[PDB]
Every structure is written in C-alpha cells, then in structure tokens.
Amino acid sequence: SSRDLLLKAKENGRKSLLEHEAKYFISSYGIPVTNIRLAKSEEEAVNFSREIGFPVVLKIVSPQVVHKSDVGGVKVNLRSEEEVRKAYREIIENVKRNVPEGILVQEFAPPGVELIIGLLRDPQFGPTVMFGLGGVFVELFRDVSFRVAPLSEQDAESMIKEVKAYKLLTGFRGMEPVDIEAIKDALIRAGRIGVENEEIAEMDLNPVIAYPKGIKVVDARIILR
Amino acid sequence: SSRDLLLKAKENGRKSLLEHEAKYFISSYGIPVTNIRLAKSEEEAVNFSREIGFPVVLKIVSPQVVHKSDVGGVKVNLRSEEEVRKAYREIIENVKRNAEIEGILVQEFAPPGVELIIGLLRDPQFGPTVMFGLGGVFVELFRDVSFRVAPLSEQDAESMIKEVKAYKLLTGFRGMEPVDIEAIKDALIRAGRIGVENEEIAEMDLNPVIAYPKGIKVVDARIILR
Amino acid sequence: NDLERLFNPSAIAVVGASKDPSKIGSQILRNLLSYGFKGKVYPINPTADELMGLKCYPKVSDVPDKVDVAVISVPSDKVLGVIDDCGKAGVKFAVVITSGFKEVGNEELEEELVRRAHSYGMRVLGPNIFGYLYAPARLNATFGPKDVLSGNVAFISQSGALGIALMGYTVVENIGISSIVSVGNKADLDDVDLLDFFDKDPNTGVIMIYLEGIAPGRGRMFIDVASRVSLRKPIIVIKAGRTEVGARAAASHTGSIAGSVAIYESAFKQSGILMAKSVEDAFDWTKALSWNPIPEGERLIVLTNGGGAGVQSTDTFADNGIYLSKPPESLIQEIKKFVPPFASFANPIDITGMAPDDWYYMGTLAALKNPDVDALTVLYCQTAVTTPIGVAKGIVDAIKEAGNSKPVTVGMVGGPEVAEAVSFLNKQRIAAYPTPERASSAMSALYAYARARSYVMKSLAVR
Amino acid sequence: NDLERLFNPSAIAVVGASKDPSKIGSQILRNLLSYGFKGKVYPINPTADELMGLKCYPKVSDVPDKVDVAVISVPSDKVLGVIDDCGKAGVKFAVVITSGFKEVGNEELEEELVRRAHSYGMRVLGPNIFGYLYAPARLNATFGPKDVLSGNVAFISQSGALGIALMGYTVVENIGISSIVSVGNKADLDDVDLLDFFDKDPNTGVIMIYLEGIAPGRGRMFIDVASRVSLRKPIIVIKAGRTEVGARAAASHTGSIAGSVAIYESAFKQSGILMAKSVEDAFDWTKALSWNPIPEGERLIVLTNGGGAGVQSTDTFADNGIYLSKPPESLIQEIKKFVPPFASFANPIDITGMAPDDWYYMGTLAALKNPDVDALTVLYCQTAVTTPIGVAKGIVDAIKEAGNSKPVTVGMVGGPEVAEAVSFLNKQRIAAYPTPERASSAMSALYAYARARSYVMKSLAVR
Ligand SMILES: CC(C)(COP(=O)(O)OP(=O)(O)OC[C@H]1O[C@@H](n2cnc3c(N)ncnc32)[C@H](O)[C@@H]1OP(=O)(O)O)[C@@H](O)C(=O)NCCC(=O)NCCS
Ligand SMILES: CC(C)(COP(=O)(O)OP(=O)(O)OC[C@H]1O[C@@H](n2cnc3c(N)ncnc32)[C@H](O)[C@@H]1OP(=O)(O)O)[C@@H](O)C(=O)NCCC(=O)NCCS
Ligand SMILES: [Cl-]
Ligand SMILES: [Cl-]
C-alpha cells in the first residue's frame, strides 16, 4: 500500500516525504506525474534513463537537502548515457563535499501552461484544495481559488473558472487551450488525498504543466503531521 | 519639421506612417526609440548595420505589407556583413512570396525587459486619450488597461500606471529588477501631447515599449492618420 | 440533539428573576408573560414565594414538573451550581444569558460549563446571549423587544447588542419573524444545530445569520447541513469580518483565532448561502425571499414609467450578472393596446411618464399572466399624473388577479406619498423599496438563490 | 454663457398656460406663484385675458417689459414660432419643456431650434425637460412638487421622470436644495455651463448630477471646469450606463451613440468627481457632504456600544480603503473615567452594551474636543438600557458644546424609536442613517472627496 510510505516516514520521525515518495504517492491516486525512478548506482540508471527516455533530469535524494539546487544537486537537459555518467558523478561529488538515499532519474517536461494545486488544512473546514496559475499569477498576484474537500465536479470546474488568470487555459497567442477536464480530475483527487490521509498536513503540486491533452505534476511536496 | 512626415504621408494618400517615419516622429517628441536606418540599397544596409552596431534586426518597410512575420519580413540577431546580406536577400525573397517596398529597416538590438503598451486614441466626448498597460497577455488577453484624457499631468501619468492590476510587474519580482517608472510617466505625458497637438493623428500605438531599471525604449510603433 | 423541546417546551424555568423588576431575569420573565406563552413558567429565586403571579421555587429541582428549558440569569460564579441542579432536575436545555466566560478570557469556566451540562445529557445555548424567541410557540425568552411581526424568517445572531437591535429593526422593515436566537459565545449549540431544526420547521422559510465564525472542526458539517437546507430554504449570512482587517478585529472580541476570509467565502458558495455585506442588503434580500417563490427561469421583465429608473435597474442587475432579454411579443401586443406609440419595449418596458395609475394595473397583470414571464420588477417615478397609493393598489390587484405567484419586487421614487405607498405594499407582503436599485438588488437576491441552489444540486449530482 | 439672469430673472414668461388648470403650462404657472416668485410673471396664451390673477398676453413680444426667461410649454409643431417671437422680444433664455425632438428622432428639428435661438443670442435649456427651480430666487418653474427643503445642494438631472421624482424624494431624505435643473435632451446649455454658474453661486455647496452622457467634443472642458469646481465644492455623479449593457440601453433611449464606460470613469477621477452607483448612495453621500467640513486628517474615530456594529463599520471602511488606527491616549483616558474595565479601545471604541444615554454625550464630546481626532462615526444599537432619542440628544449636545466643526456621521439600529431618533438628527442637519454600514459609507464619502480634491490639486501642480 502507498500508506507504507507514510508509515515509514512516521516511524523515522520525518515531517515530509522525499521527492520520489511524494511522486509515487500522488501517482497511486491517479494524478499523472513526470515518470521517475530511483537510482542506487550510476549504472542502475542506464536501464531507467533508457526506459524513461532521454533527456533525463537528475536529482539527489537525501533527507538532508531541502533545496536541491544550491548544493548543486540538480542537473538538467541530460541527453545521453555518457551525459548521465557525468551528471551523476558530479552530483555525488558536489553534495558530498557540501554535506558528508540515491539519485532520482526524471523525465523531461515539455513546456506548457504551468499550474499550482494545493492542499491545506483549515481550522474550521478541514482539508481544502487550492488552485491557481503558475509563475507570477500565484506568487506575485496571489490569484487563487479554494474549495473545501471533498470536491464535486461542480466545485472543481467553478474554482477553475473563478481565477482571474483563467483565460490562460482557454487559448491565447501562441498557446492552445489546455485539458481542463484533466485539471478538474486532479483537483478532485487532491481533495480525496486530503480527506483520506489524516497524516498529511499539507501538499504542494507545483509546478503542474497542463497540455492540450492531459497534465503532468513535475514537482510535489507532501508534509506530514 | 517632423510635421513634414505627416504632410507627405497625407499628400501621398497614406492612412498611416511607415515604421521609420513613425519612430522618427515620436523620437522628435523626446520619447526614446530603437536606433534605426532605412536601407536605400542592399549595400546601404550593411553600411547602416556597421554604423548602428551589431547585432541588428532587419524589417521590411512597404505601404503594402501590412504584416510582419506572416509575410516573412523580419530577421533578428544579425552580427556580420555576411549575416546581413543573407538575411537581406531572403527579405526580398520571403515577403514577396506570401507590394512596392519603401526599403529595408535596419534596427538596433533591444535587450529584453518588461514590455509595456502606450496607446493614444480619440474619444468622441473627451478627445485625445492616453492608454497604458503591461504587454503580452496582460493587455491582449486580459484587457488590463488604464485611461487618462489628455493633456496628462504627472499625477495622471503616475496614478494610471499604479492603477493597472499588473502594476507589480514594474516594481521588482522573481528574476526581474524594478523598472524606471519615471521614464514611463514621461513617455505617457508626451504621448498625450502628441495627441493634443497633432490633429491629423487619429490613433497611435507604442507597442512593444520595453522598460528597464533605467529608461525605456519604444521597439515598435504605429501612427494612423486622418 | 433534537431541539423540538427547546423551541416548543412544555415548561420553562427562569433562574434569576427577582422582586426587583429591573433585573435581567425579571425582564425576561415579563417578556415571556407579555408575549403569551401557554406552557408552564417557573420563576426560580432563593426567597420569593411568587413572581408576577406565578409560584416561585428556590431550585429548578424543586419544581413538581419536568422542566424542558432553564433560562439562566445569575452571575457567572453561580452558574455552575444552577447547571448541576438543572441536571438533577433532568433539564434538556440551559439557555445561559450570563456573561463572563470565554469572551472575557475565562475559557476554562466556559469549557467546564459545557462539560458539566453534557454529563447530564443537557445542551447549552450561549453563554453570553440575550435569549431566544419562537413565534409559533408564543415564546419570547429574551430581554429584547416584547414583540415582533409574525412570519417565516428565523434570525440567528452571534452578536449581542447588534442582534437585539436588529430584532427591533425587523419591525420597522416589516419582516415577519418565526424566531430570534442569540447564540453568543456559541460554546455548545451552534448554527449547524439550529439549521437542522429550522430545516424541519414548517414555520420557517428563510434563515438569516449574523455570523463571526464557527468552531474549529465544525466547518465540514456546516457545509453538509447548510447545503441541504439551501435546497428548500434560502440562507443569508451577514459575515462579520468580511475583510482581512475586520477578521483580525472581530476575532479578538470573541477571544478566538481569525478565520480565513477566502475559505469562508468558498464554504458559503458550496453551501448555497448568500453572503450579505451589510444589514440593509441582508434585510432587503430577506424580505424578497420571504415573500416570493423562486424564479423558474431567466425571463425577467422590468416595467417602468421612465427610462432613467429603468437604466439604474439595468446597471444594478448587470452588476449581479443578470441580463434582460426581449419581452414576449404576446406581452408587447397586450401592452400596446393602451400604451403610446413612443413607448419602448426593449426590456425594461417603458410605459412613459404619462402613464396613469391603471396602466400599472394592466401592465403588471399582462406581465404576470404571460406564460413566458418568470419574474417582474415594477418601477415607479412619482408624477402629477399618478397617485402613489393608486399605483400600489393597481399592483396589488394585478398580483391577486394573476391568480398565480411569480416573484415580484417594486421600486417607487418620490416624496411622502411614495413613502406611505411603499409602506402599504410591504405591509401587504409585497417587497417594495424607495429606489430602483434596491428593488433590483432584491430581485437579484431571488435569482442569486436560484443559482446558489443550482450550484448545490450540481455539486450533489450522482456519478 | 452667463446664467445669472436664468436663475435670477426680473421677468419670466410661461407660454402655454391655460384656463384649464390640468395642462403642464398651468401647473408650472401655479408652482411659480405658489413658491413665491417676486419678479414679474407673464402668462402667455392666445385668448385668455388673465391667468391666475395676472394679465395674460398672446405673444411674448406683446409684453410691455424685457422678458429674461420664457418657459415654453406648447407642442413641438408650435415651438419654433414661439422662439422667433421670443427672439424678437429679446428674451435671453428659452426653457423648452416641450418633447418630440431628438429623443424621438427629430434631430433636425432640435438642431433648428438651437440655431434659431442662437441667431437671436438666445440660449436653450432642454428641450424635453420638466423645468428648473432656484430657491434663493424663490423660483419654482417646474411642474414637479411645489416645494423643497431649503439648503445648499444643486441637483442637475438629465432624466425626466426619475429627476422629477428625485426632486420629491429629497424632502423625504431631508436634503436641503438650492436648485433643481432638468436638462433633458441637453441640446444647448449643459452640465459644463451649469457647473460654471454653481461654482460662483454662494448658495450652493454641493452639486449632484444624474448624467447619461455629454455631447461630442465637450468632455475636455467638462473636466477643466469640474476639476476646478471640485477644489471647493464636491460633485457627485449618478452615472446612467455604468455597465456596457446599460450604456447601450441608455444611449438608444437618448438617440445617441454609447460612450466609453472606462473613459468616463477616468474623466470623473480627473475631475475629482465622486461616482455613485445608486440613488441611495448619492443621497447618503450628498447629505454628509452638505452638512460637514472635509476631514483635515486620517484620525477617524468610531464610537460604538457593541462590537458587532463596530465590525460592520470596520469592514465597510476597509472596502473604501479607510483604515482605523489606535485612538489618542488622552481620549482613552478621558473615556476610561466612566467606561467599564472590559471596554475595548482598539478603535472602534466599544463603550459596551451597558452604556446609558449620557455615555454617548460624554464619549462624543471627548472625541470631538480631542485635538488628535479628525472625524467621528457614532454607532448605536438600541437596547432597553437606553432611549434612542436620549442618545440622539446627547450627540446633538456634544456637537454644539464641542464648539468646533469636525465631520460626524451617526448610525442607529433599532425599532420605531430609532427611526424617529434618526429623523430627529437629520432634521438638525446631523447626517444619520439606520445602519452602521450606511453611516460608515457616508463618512467614507467625506474622505473620498478629500482624496479626490487632493488628486485634482496634485493634477494642477505647476512644473
Ligand atoms: C446574569 C446577570 C444579568 C446577573 O446580574 P444580576 O441580576 O445583577 O445578578 P444577581 O446577583 O442580582 O442575581 C439575580 C438574582 O438571582 C438570584 N440567585 C443567585 N444565585 C441563585 C441561584 N443559585 N439560584 C436561584 N437564584 C439565584 C439572586 O438572589 C438575585 O435575586 P434577588 O434580587 O432576589 O437577590 C449578569 O451576571 C450578566 O451576566 N449580565 C450581562 C448579561 C448579558 O449582557 N448577556 C448578553 C447580552 S448580548
Ligand atoms: C408641451 C406639451 C405639454 C403641450 O401639450 P398641451 O398643453 O396639451 O398642448 P396644447 O395644444 O393644449 O397647448 C397648451 C396651450 O398653449 C396654447 N398655445 C398653443 N400655441 C401657442 C402659441 N404659439 N403661443 C401661445 N400659446 C399657445 C394653446 O391654446 C393651449 O391653451 P388653451 O387651453 O387655452 O387652448 C406637449 O406637447 C409635450 O411636449 N408634453 C411632454 C412634456 C414633458 O413631459 N416633458 C418632459 C418632462 S420630464
Ligand atoms: Cl426618467
Ligand atoms: Cl454587538
């Protein structure tokens, strides 16, 4: 069961899931994520990079590293095996010397319209789902909508239409309309995760990329309590 | 006088200024523009590219060619004689196969920044009116704009800037410095003056205008005559 | 859990009534008798043999009867003892008027009050409340006004002074009341419990709530209950702390943490609740919702003897997302039988400033009788050509003779004669207002509720 | 372009008065006499020897006198003939009541009317109007109500039926009027010309305008004039066609193209004008601005006998960009001399629900006398421990004894006694309202005008 990830985290006194664990968990709820695998060696990756498909992004996985980039724990646009051997040894090299679980091999995410899907716990209303457009639209303008879980289809659709930036989803200069049904589906499932898993205090799906067909969560945080 | 541009255009039965004429006009009002030259020959283009300084953008200039990219009249980041003669030869080629040409516009490179739009329109009741908004989706998709009837005071210019919902894009954010708000106010006021003073200008578009930490630059401009 | 015997008790005790007629307990007892309670009333006082002609007892447990409700009006340092005695007496509800609990920082005393009540199977209303009224039981257990107009509106207030003032204000605004409930500190019984009762109450058709907040962990149930109630009865919430700054301020008055503005709003939308930003808006909407059926379609007609009032109406509706459409040709033809050629039929239908009184009769009658008309807002600008009361009575006659019921609101502008005409209409339970924007906002509340109800229905759709 | 002799004429003619008292002309003549005009009044009728005890003439040019103003109430097919005669008689202003011009598609007739007036140096008001009133000249040349309350508010209306009704409504809302001007089709004289007169009029302190649109090419001067007026006198505009949909509706009613909503709004901001979305807001704001000086600083105090009214106030102010700050320690100390320990001094100052009448006197007096207080909103929720009229009298006494002038608004909530108390306050020109939100919105209008004036001042700064 995916609950094993939460149980293991709790027994080890962790207050969050590691990146791959978070991706696995939300995937098990039917929310599409960037394809990932965990490498316990430089060679274990070749089957996985091959399987996943180049170019693959590499990320260090360690309870220690809250920020992956400052330590030098990230490597982007790796387009071949030789390029994995290099980006792999470099990240081992780098983080070790900065900080003495494995390497995450992650698929490339084609550009699209970025979204955020949140889950928080309100003192009065309990698990609550948050939606907004990515980038400046949430971070700078704070354009978000909320619905208390569980979400109906009516809740998901209306909370999407309610944000000021909504038109970024229905086609504009050099960008096709994106899959709104797939967004609604993910919102509802995010609410279900909150309702069902009491040990999840908070969850962040950020960034989520929406395409003309389907969506993909690129990064996800799950906070425990 | 820069009014000669308006007089000549009208005498030739034109309903707008050509790009180089428009840019010259608004420059004459103290609004900063991309340095430009009009090519009077394929060889005259390199002479200007040299003078202006690489990298240079090249643009078709013709009363007939209403469109930019669709026709194929544009070329960016040309850094040499060879790269100009190449981009020029296509520029004759590309647009025709998609229309008397005034010439080819050689334009200086515009470093990226925060894009703005400054508009001038004529309202039936209130006459010349200045429009402001952030570029890209913010005006075109969201219609986030502010208006002030000309002539504009400094108070009008500043308040109409702060009034748009996208205002915070001007005051520093993730990976972008605050831009020169004073230079924006100054350009708005001067746009209002252009409208008040030049009755044969029906409408004007400064789009895109690029704002930087210091100063601004009009990259493209339309002036419609009446 | 069942509040049937709170609102319809066989026996009520008033603990803390006194020979002194000025004390709160005595004021409550006086209202109970004045308003005409038909059950048994038991004044409770340590020394009095009788109060207001009723046998008095020193303890509720001395009463030779089963007391359903004890209204407690003794100081806080005496409350817990009374609670133990009421518990022993088997009392179901403790209506605790008394102040001096969580609202002044004595959170522990308040929690002990509830803990102690519950150990006896007893529920608590309050504390820190001005009581409650239930019209169908001729029950006025408040120290507020002695009387209210009878009707179908239940008003729940978390605020004290404003709540008791609003109780009086309902009379001036001609709002018929089924119940007034002061909930105060809301330490036990709350909005959810009350909504459950009013849901089942055939006497209550509209619920208005002055609300600051609900207790932690209570929100999910609030939405569950409120949404189902909204399927049949409109809920209007006057939210205290609508803004970030207001939310911070109101929270410290209740001795609580400030709730999320955005999430409350979302909860209200998911509940089908209408959020009012002001007392006037709440009362205006409550009036219309109380006295009208919900529109069954979008075919709203505006009738006016002036373009100007009509435009104010159009703008106001537009602000509420309501847009008018061309009237039915049948309606236009009917009205052309008496209207001048230079009248306008774009909707609003402008019957022009020359319109005498009976044109309002005929126009209103034609509109309401028309099968393709769902709702009617009637606008009147006083002229020398008309009598305001004449116009009002024409509207009344048209409504009666339409032999049906469609939502109607009326806006009348003018001097003292318009003021009296508006009053007349409202006392006839026809929602009337002194401006066209208020009449239009009132009708807008009817459509807002229809859409709110639709939101809830869609959200409960089966997969 | 000087309107001195329009508003203060020596002689007025009424063309189209009749033996028949029911005709418009006769109604206007009756109001002129009734309201007490002291100049010469010349009824003009083809056959009558005298009307209303006054010698009548068949033509204005037959009058042995210089007629300043001709109020023309004959059918459209007879107006131009009357204009030529008035021109020959040298009349300065033609007040053309008559309808049937541009508003019904007769643009050519309307333009002919104006050109012909102008060929004689004559100006036109209207056509299609209900006349005008000027209180300081005891001149009621309307067929509206015979009387208004005297005061300093000038009301200009582009609407007819709504305008004449609003004229009556001012009485009900206790608004003192210096002038009523119906401008109707606005074919010649318009808002700019009228604003120029009211600018210089010492009898007028506030201008309220029901405005649909202004003529092409007139907007720049409108801003030029209005902005300068706003430096000393507030202008409130009720805009008809605030919305896209409303703009189209109102435009085709006037027989014009629809103007830009966004640009009108900017023009109002550049003019220092306050735009009202409703009659109620406009009247509520006009009352406060008419009876109060503008606040000289941000130090606004709210006084309340209940946290709930205070929170409604806080939210409403916040909605208007007005934020309260802590009261001066001196004020807090003054009030602590009579207030219970559990009162709240955060601003609003909560003197608690136990507050008797005289606490409103003392609290108000202390606030208004404090040098670090700029404005005061007093809120009152009726309970049995107070009398509404007592509270009102306390507020009145506090204001008088404060021996100064700071802006004050009052919000009182309660039953019939509060209605009477509010009336009492308003008849003494103390801006009072039946809800805390309306009192707070009214005070917000005082600050809105201060900020608008400041916009204009900075806008006129020298380079
Ligand atoms: C509840 C409250 C009104 C009582 O104040 P009070 O009337 O001055 O208090 P008292 O001490 O006089 O007690 C009332 C009566 O109950 C009697 N009493 C006291 N303890 C009693 C007991 N255990 N059983 C029965 N009677 C009792 C007292 O003897 C007195 O009667 P008396 O005149 O014969 O002596 C007061 O404490 C309070 O909370 N006031 C504010 C309430 C409020 O504002 N609520 C919210 C409105 S929004
Ligand atoms: C102006 C208007 C009221 C005139 O209609 P009316 O009074 O019924 O018309 P009449 O033909 O009866 O004329 C009125 C009087 O003027 C007299 N009259 C006509 N032409 C005249 C002239 N050239 N000189 C003098 N008197 C004249 C008529 O003889 C009549 O008097 P009588 O009763 O003694 O015969 C009408 O045409 C109109 O426009 N009504 C709408 C007004 C309105 O609502 N305006 C907007 C307000 S919001
Ligand atoms: Cl009207
Ligand atoms: Cl209160």
mmCIF file of C-alpha atoms in Angstrom, chain B residues 39-149:
data_model
loop_
_atom_site.group_PDB
_atom_site.id
_atom_site.type_symbol
_atom_site.label_atom_id
_atom_site.label_comp_id
_atom_site.label_asym_id
_atom_site.label_seq_id
_atom_site.Cartn_x
_atom_site.Cartn_y
_atom_site.Cartn_z
ATOM 1 C CA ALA B 39 18.140 50.822 -46.415
ATOM 2 C CA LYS B 40 18.404 52.538 -49.794
ATOM 3 C CA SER B 41 20.287 49.520 -51.169
ATOM 4 C CA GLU B 42 21.442 46.011 -50.243
ATOM 5 C CA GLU B 43 24.873 47.544 -49.771
ATOM 6 C CA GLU B 44 23.357 50.543 -47.994
ATOM 7 C CA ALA B 45 22.029 48.114 -45.387
ATOM 8 C CA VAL B 46 25.483 46.864 -44.344
ATOM 9 C CA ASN B 47 26.751 50.460 -44.055
ATOM 10 C CA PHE B 48 23.965 51.138 -41.561
ATOM 11 C CA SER B 49 24.388 47.855 -39.705
ATOM 12 C CA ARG B 50 28.026 48.850 -39.239
ATOM 13 C CA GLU B 51 27.105 52.358 -38.146
ATOM 14 C CA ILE B 52 24.378 51.225 -35.739
ATOM 15 C CA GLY B 53 26.330 48.278 -34.351
ATOM 16 C CA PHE B 54 25.722 44.545 -34.355
ATOM 17 C CA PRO B 55 23.565 42.737 -33.593
ATOM 18 C CA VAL B 56 20.980 44.346 -35.889
ATOM 19 C CA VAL B 57 17.367 43.430 -36.603
ATOM 20 C CA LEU B 58 16.081 43.795 -40.196
ATOM 21 C CA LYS B 59 12.468 44.661 -41.102
ATOM 22 C CA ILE B 60 10.578 45.123 -44.368
ATOM 23 C CA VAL B 61 9.148 48.611 -44.972
ATOM 24 C CA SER B 62 6.356 48.947 -47.510
ATOM 25 C CA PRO B 63 2.918 50.647 -47.582
ATOM 26 C CA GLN B 64 1.509 47.415 -48.987
ATOM 27 C CA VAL B 65 2.989 44.955 -46.483
ATOM 28 C CA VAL B 66 0.633 45.294 -43.555
ATOM 29 C CA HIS B 67 2.073 42.173 -41.830
ATOM 30 C CA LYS B 68 5.425 41.323 -40.210
ATOM 31 C CA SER B 69 6.237 37.654 -39.592
ATOM 32 C CA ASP B 70 3.423 36.028 -41.579
ATOM 33 C CA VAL B 71 4.764 37.543 -44.796
ATOM 34 C CA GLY B 72 8.348 36.919 -43.615
ATOM 35 C CA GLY B 73 9.698 40.460 -43.403
ATOM 36 C CA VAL B 74 11.749 40.194 -40.192
ATOM 37 C CA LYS B 75 15.216 38.994 -39.085
ATOM 38 C CA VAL B 76 16.832 39.120 -35.639
ATOM 39 C CA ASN B 77 20.391 38.999 -34.246
ATOM 40 C CA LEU B 78 22.446 39.522 -37.403
ATOM 41 C CA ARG B 79 26.073 40.008 -36.333
ATOM 42 C CA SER B 80 28.023 40.473 -39.576
ATOM 43 C CA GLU B 81 28.111 41.591 -43.194
ATOM 44 C CA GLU B 82 27.611 38.004 -44.354
ATOM 45 C CA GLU B 83 24.677 37.568 -41.975
ATOM 46 C CA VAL B 84 23.118 40.789 -43.291
ATOM 47 C CA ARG B 85 23.467 40.002 -46.989
ATOM 48 C CA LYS B 86 21.982 36.615 -46.256
ATOM 49 C CA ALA B 87 19.043 37.930 -44.204
ATOM 50 C CA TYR B 88 18.505 40.752 -46.707
ATOM 51 C CA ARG B 89 18.418 38.576 -49.797
ATOM 52 C CA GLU B 90 15.761 36.403 -48.178
ATOM 53 C CA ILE B 91 13.950 39.526 -47.042
ATOM 54 C CA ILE B 92 13.360 40.446 -50.688
ATOM 55 C CA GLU B 93 12.527 36.746 -51.382
ATOM 56 C CA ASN B 94 10.429 35.747 -48.381
ATOM 57 C CA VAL B 95 7.842 38.517 -48.221
ATOM 58 C CA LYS B 96 7.072 38.693 -51.948
ATOM 59 C CA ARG B 97 6.109 35.021 -51.999
ATOM 60 C CA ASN B 98 3.428 35.363 -49.298
ATOM 61 C CA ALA B 99 3.840 45.263 -52.933
ATOM 62 C CA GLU B 100 6.190 48.211 -53.531
ATOM 63 C CA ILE B 101 8.895 48.332 -50.868
ATOM 64 C CA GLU B 102 9.992 51.643 -49.314
ATOM 65 C CA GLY B 103 13.174 49.869 -48.251
ATOM 66 C CA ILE B 104 14.603 47.639 -45.532
ATOM 67 C CA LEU B 105 14.718 48.878 -41.969
ATOM 68 C CA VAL B 106 17.910 48.145 -40.058
ATOM 69 C CA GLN B 107 17.156 48.377 -36.339
ATOM 70 C CA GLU B 108 19.399 48.136 -33.285
ATOM 71 C CA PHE B 109 19.063 45.185 -30.911
ATOM 72 C CA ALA B 110 16.645 45.611 -27.999
ATOM 73 C CA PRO B 111 17.733 43.867 -24.793
ATOM 74 C CA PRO B 112 14.826 42.025 -23.100
ATOM 75 C CA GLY B 113 12.868 43.671 -20.297
ATOM 76 C CA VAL B 114 9.329 44.348 -19.107
ATOM 77 C CA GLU B 115 7.143 45.087 -22.103
ATOM 78 C CA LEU B 116 4.541 47.861 -21.969
ATOM 79 C CA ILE B 117 1.955 49.341 -24.268
ATOM 80 C CA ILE B 118 1.244 53.047 -24.545
ATOM 81 C CA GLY B 119 -1.778 53.977 -26.621
ATOM 82 C CA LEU B 120 -3.342 57.161 -27.911
ATOM 83 C CA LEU B 121 -6.931 57.185 -29.123
ATOM 84 C CA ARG B 122 -9.630 59.774 -29.748
ATOM 85 C CA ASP B 123 -12.819 59.558 -27.703
ATOM 86 C CA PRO B 124 -15.940 61.236 -29.185
ATOM 87 C CA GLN B 125 -16.658 63.049 -25.890
ATOM 88 C CA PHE B 126 -13.235 63.569 -24.326
ATOM 89 C CA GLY B 127 -10.916 63.776 -27.353
ATOM 90 C CA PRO B 128 -7.280 62.590 -27.176
ATOM 91 C CA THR B 129 -6.925 59.893 -24.518
ATOM 92 C CA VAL B 130 -3.828 58.012 -23.361
ATOM 93 C CA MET B 131 -3.945 54.273 -22.657
ATOM 94 C CA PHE B 132 -1.460 52.291 -20.569
ATOM 95 C CA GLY B 133 -0.987 48.604 -19.842
ATOM 96 C CA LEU B 134 1.521 45.789 -19.427
ATOM 97 C CA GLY B 135 2.449 43.967 -22.605
ATOM 98 C CA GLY B 136 1.718 40.455 -23.775
ATOM 99 C CA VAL B 137 -1.328 38.694 -22.402
ATOM 100 C CA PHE B 138 -1.983 41.459 -19.899
ATOM 101 C CA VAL B 139 -3.458 43.859 -22.470
ATOM 102 C CA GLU B 140 -4.212 41.477 -25.335
ATOM 103 C CA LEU B 141 -5.862 38.714 -23.313
ATOM 104 C CA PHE B 142 -6.910 40.287 -20.002
ATOM 105 C CA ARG B 143 -7.598 43.819 -21.290
ATOM 106 C CA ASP B 144 -5.834 45.245 -18.231
ATOM 107 C CA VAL B 145 -5.557 48.926 -19.195
ATOM 108 C CA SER B 146 -5.914 52.405 -17.727
ATOM 109 C CA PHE B 147 -7.002 55.641 -19.421
ATOM 110 C CA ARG B 148 -6.383 59.351 -18.912
ATOM 111 C CA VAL B 149 -7.755 62.194 -21.023
#
